Amino acid sequence: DNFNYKNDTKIIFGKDNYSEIGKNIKIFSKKTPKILLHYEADGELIKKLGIYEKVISSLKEFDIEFIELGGVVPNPRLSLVYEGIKICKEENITFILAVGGASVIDSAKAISLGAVDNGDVWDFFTAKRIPQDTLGIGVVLTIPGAGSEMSESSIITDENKKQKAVCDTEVNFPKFAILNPEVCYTIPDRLMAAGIVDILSHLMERYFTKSIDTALSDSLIEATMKIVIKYGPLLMKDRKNYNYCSQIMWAATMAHNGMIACGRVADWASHRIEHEISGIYDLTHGIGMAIIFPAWMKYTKNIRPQIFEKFFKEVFNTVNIDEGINKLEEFFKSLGINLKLSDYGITEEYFSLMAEKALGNSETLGRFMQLNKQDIINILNLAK
Amino acid sequence: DNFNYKNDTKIIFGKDNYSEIGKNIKIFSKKTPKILLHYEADGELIKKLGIYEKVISSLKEFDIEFIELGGVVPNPRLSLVYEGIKICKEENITFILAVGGASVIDSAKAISLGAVDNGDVWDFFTAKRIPQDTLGIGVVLTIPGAGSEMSESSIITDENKKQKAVCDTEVNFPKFAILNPEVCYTIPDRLMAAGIVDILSHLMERYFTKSIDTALSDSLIEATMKIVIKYGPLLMKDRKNYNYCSQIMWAATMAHNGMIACGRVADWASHRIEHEISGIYDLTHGIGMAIIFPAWMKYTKNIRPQIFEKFFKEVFNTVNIDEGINKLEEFFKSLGINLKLSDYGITEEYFSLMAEKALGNSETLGRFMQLNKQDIINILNLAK
Ligand SMILES: Nc1ncnc2c1ncn2[C@@H]1O[C@H](COP(=O)(O)OP(=O)(O)O)[C@@H](O)[C@H]1O
Ligand SMILES: Nc1ncnc2c1ncn2[C@@H]1O[C@H](COP(=O)(O)OP(=O)(O)O)[C@@H](O)[C@H]1O
Ligand SMILES: [Co+2]
Ligand SMILES: [Co+2]
């Protein structure tokens, strides 16, 4: 149980602080700054919300020249990275400002890698070369999910060969990330509820571990989980409450922090199972993790029952696993989320297909408990 | 309640990992590495403990040339910094390895500033110039206190003018810090108990705040505090227990982390009062904070009684402040620590003197509650 931790992304947390876009662009750009403004599609969202205005007002206030590059698709495309790299070498951009979510942050990270490289940037995703430098980006985050605003990962899909790939390296760390909980206000209900489930799930996947001697870490993960459980329902019924949004958005940031997960072994069983439901049905990730995770917990309740006793004691105030599992189901339901796959017209038709696709070329799946094709179908039956 | 957070010190946490001294020296040194080895006095301690051996074995295994510079005094002296700066410019040192505690880390940080500067490094402590670069240091921490192994501060005392000063800047951040809980084993009992109090106190000084809307942050600070309260007594009676030492040493690291204190206003009333007791008597910091903090809490129990209710509920399982205060006194006593100043032959003789020296040129002192000369004497009377 040894671990390393590094994370140098500067966090700018709060509201009415839109000057720090430019103030921080100057702190991390070479000499005279000339930035590239990255956003999804044609700024429809960020301009609708007023993020576009407040951004330009910050660059102007700081005399920061800038070009705009738009047109990100949810799974961002290497053809657009190739474009941004061209403009950054052509127009001498010294810094990229990602305004959006992980789809445009990942483009920002990919463009920032090849703007400084003299070769193909796909060599950095297909494991040919290990990038040693990046131009540098700052993020203006619009939705508190995934955590790409402080990760070292970038996920680009090359459509011409259809192979999606990633690149994990310490140079991908955004130089700063602007974190205003107000951006939560405009998010649609079902999207925000699923985002709450994503935070809790990210915490649970590291919490439920066969690792030992992790008491401080247990507490910190419990404390964050507990906050998501108290404030998640409140934010859902009072969507413009800055307090409620500060807790949830700060919980999500912490959820992506390996100071509180101290090299404890995460289990991705639920993620993988959910992935396959989402590959065949049009179902949002967070909603699928509210349906799958309680089923997975039921199936794995015998592995380490004490760590299940602990979870429901510290988080739901009950040493009864069954009562605690139903409380967690009730919590999901209080977010608007129906708890069964039948509810979403999903039938047992492809349970078998999804189980084999989950497993791929392996016999079992998971770390907390090793799950084979039938195990995975039993879990999908618990969730029907 | 907006805040910023940056911290890029790489944490290497664990044991039987002494290769990472050299492995990490190579990761952060320019081209060919030639390091300076910094330690207190003549390596008596670190060599006695076997840290010296295991270090040299790592530099050799990695072909790392190195000179040794010793002779740190607990309050490190600018005359020695001046020496180390000379050797770093003379002998072309590309990196400093601080092996010790905050006394030698602060020398390491000061030497690392002027090895790269073309002027006097005291200009960086006396607020004349703001350093913009540092050579770079890695720490091998021997005692989990103060947190200098991940701070941006360096505290040097110039003895020829007797003025002590500090320099706070993002370049002071160690490039890495080696954190092995085993180094806790050899620490004397009273020194380790006081170090446990220092962690709890660092957490309490930020916890007890007039700031509002800090629920997630409250939980994280509570979780850490609670761990210090559970494991601190156990580590005291089982000094070679790696688990117990991992929790406490990881609690101390987290205690110095502003991810869990989200720009909440800290109060230094207890620190300042304790400082003056320690200025007149030969009394260790941690012991003085076990005597002062319960007195300060008694005196300030009426400011924000709900945040006192909360503290003792989440940390001691009681909504009674009095019962909770006595529990905290009992906790200190379970660390070997006597709870009164009379016990240490300290009398009311200089309560008046210490109160004026605490206050300096100000009328009151503290943020949670503004404390004037008589307030401070009342608190010293509670602690007699
Ligand atoms: N502040 C916001 N308000 C409303 N909708 C948003 C906001 N931020 C993102 N979205 C929406 O969420 C959808 C998908 O989220 P995305 O931006 O890809 O972030 P992530 O990849 O982190 O989930 C987008 O179609 C976008 O319309
Ligand atoms: N691992 C250790 N084992 C025993 N004693 C230690 C250890 N590390 C430091 N000390 C002792 O603690 C005393 C003061 O601590 P110091 O090294 O100045 O660290 P800090 O300044 O962080 O408290 C020193 O005299 C030293 O003898
Ligand atoms: Co997940
Ligand atoms: Co203190």
TrEMBL record, chains A, B:
GO terms for cellular component: cytosol. PROSITE patterns: ADH_IRON_2. Residues 193-381 form the Fe-containing alcohol dehydrogenase-like C-terminal domain. ADP binds at A102, T142, V183. It is an enzyme of class 1 (oxidoreductase). Keywords: Metal-binding, Nucleotide-binding, Oxidoreductase. This is NADH-dependent alcohol dehydrogenase. It comes from Fusobacterium nucleatum subsp. nucleatum (strain ATCC 25586 / DSM 15643 / BCRC 10681 / CIP 101130 / JCM 8532 / KCTC 2640 / LMG 13131 / VPI 4355). The lineage of its organism: Bacteria, Fusobacteriati, Fusobacteriota, Fusobacteriia, Fusobacteriales.
